Amino acid sequence: PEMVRGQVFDVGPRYTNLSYIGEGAYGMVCSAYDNLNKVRVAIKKISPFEHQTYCQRTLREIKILLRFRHENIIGINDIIRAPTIEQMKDVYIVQDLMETDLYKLLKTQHLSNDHICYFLYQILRGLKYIHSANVLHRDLKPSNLLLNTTCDLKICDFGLARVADPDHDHTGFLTEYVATRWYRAPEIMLNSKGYTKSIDIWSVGCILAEMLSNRPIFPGKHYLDQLNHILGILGSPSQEDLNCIINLKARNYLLSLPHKNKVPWNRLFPNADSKALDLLDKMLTFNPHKRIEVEQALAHPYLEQYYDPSDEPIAEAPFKFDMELDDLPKEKLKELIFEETARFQP
Numbered sequence: 001p002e003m004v005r006g007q008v009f010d011v012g013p014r015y016t017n018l019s020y021i022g023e024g025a026y027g028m029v030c031s032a033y034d035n036l037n038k039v040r041v042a043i044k045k046i047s048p049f050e051h052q053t054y055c056q057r058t059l060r061e062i063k064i065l066l067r068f069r070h071e072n073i074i075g076i077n078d079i080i081r082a083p084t085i086e087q088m089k090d091v092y093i094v095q096d097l098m099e100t101d102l103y104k105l106l107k108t109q110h111l112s113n114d115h116i117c118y119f120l121y122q123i124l125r126g127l128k129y130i131h132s133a134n135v136l137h138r139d140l141k142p143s144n145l146l147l148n149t150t151c152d153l154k155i156c157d158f159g160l161a162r163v164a165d166p167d168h169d170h171t172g173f174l175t176e177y178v179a180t181r182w183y184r185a186p187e188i189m190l191n192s193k194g195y196t197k198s199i200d201i202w203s204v205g206c207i208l209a210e211m212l213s214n215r216p217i218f219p220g221k222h223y224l225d226q227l228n229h230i231l232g233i234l235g236s237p238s239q240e241d242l243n244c245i246i247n248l249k250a251r252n253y254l255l256s257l258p259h260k261n262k263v264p265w266n267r268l269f270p271n272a273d274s275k276a277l278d279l280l281d282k283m284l285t286f287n288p289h290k291r292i293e294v295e296q297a298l299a300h301p302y303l304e305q306y307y308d309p310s311d312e313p314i315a316e317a318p319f320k321f322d323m324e325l326d327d328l329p330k331e332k333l334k335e336l337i338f339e340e341t342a343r344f345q346p
């Protein structure tokens with residue numbers, strides 16, 4: 001088999017000329033030449049079967065990415081694995097090769113207003129489809145937004161995604177959470193499990209702010225510091241917004257803080273388009289019930305050049321997990337991954 005930087009990368013006859021690209025949130029990633037379609041592609045090696053947690057993330061992603069079909073969501077072109085469950089130690093996921101991601105771009109490049117607008121449009125267009133299927137991404141951030149050399153954008157990493165469940169969103173103060181800190185909505189720290197769509201719009205607002213300035217807007221260093229960063233800019237919440245928080249520990253924590261006034265966006269981003277700032281304000285609203293939804297965001301005057309609801313598809317049905325998944329053993333999950341990947345076997 002082909003070998004790469006001290007590891008087996010056996011992707012068989014079809015894919016050759018392997019070259020290390022990096023580590024994604026699963027394992028090693030390599031580019032390779034696809035001998036059938038004659039293009040270079042990206043291949044991610046996943047070795048998840050020695051952890052119930054990795055298997056769950058892997059399965060969830062495979063299931064979602066195979067059901068979705070959309071220009072702004074990364075697809076799966078091929079999946080490589082052994083012919084039998086007994087011999088299957090790794091799985092290889094093959095996808096279109098992208099040049100870069102928004103994280104790398106923001107480190108190194110100033111974006112024009114036209115690029116910002118176009119990128120934002122594509123994010124929201126893909127998010128419209130995801131949310132129409134009743135799915136929440138829950139970890140939107142610059143690293144999860146891939147770009148090719150013509151600035152086409154694709155959303156990736158559906159490992160933390162969930163079906164929306166508004167009825168079960170409530171929890172106590174300071175409840176643990178898994179998704180990337182700087183892009184977490186304020187309610188996650190206060191009273192929310194992140195089971196509603198408004199979680200994703202907050203993350204998109206954070207991303208917009210970062211595109212405007214090249215730096216993260218709420219770079220909290222730990223769980224609670226994330227909130228003080230938010231409040232220093234948005235200001236103290238109103239009585240009305242506090243009235244929505246019924247849990248006493250969360251409400252009384254907020255009442256204990258000194259008063260902070262809002263910092264107007266135009267002071268933070270003096271070069272920004274005023275329409276971009278108006279939309280940002282509506283995404284970065286403290287109260288999730290007052291936060292703009294994806295379809296309203298697409299129709300905002302900032303995006304008028306691109307907005308076309310007839311070219312902004314929705315999913316054909318809501319998405320559902322047949323089995324629970326969360327309470328399944330390793331052995332079962334292995335069998336399910338084997339079964340889901342069968343359609344790519346000769």
Ligand SMILES: Nc1nc(N)n(-c2ccccc2)n1
Nearest residue numbers: 022024029042095096097098
């Ligand atoms: N589909 C694709 N294209 C690239 N470069 N991908 C990549 C994603 C994360 C880390 C390294 C590479 N993924």
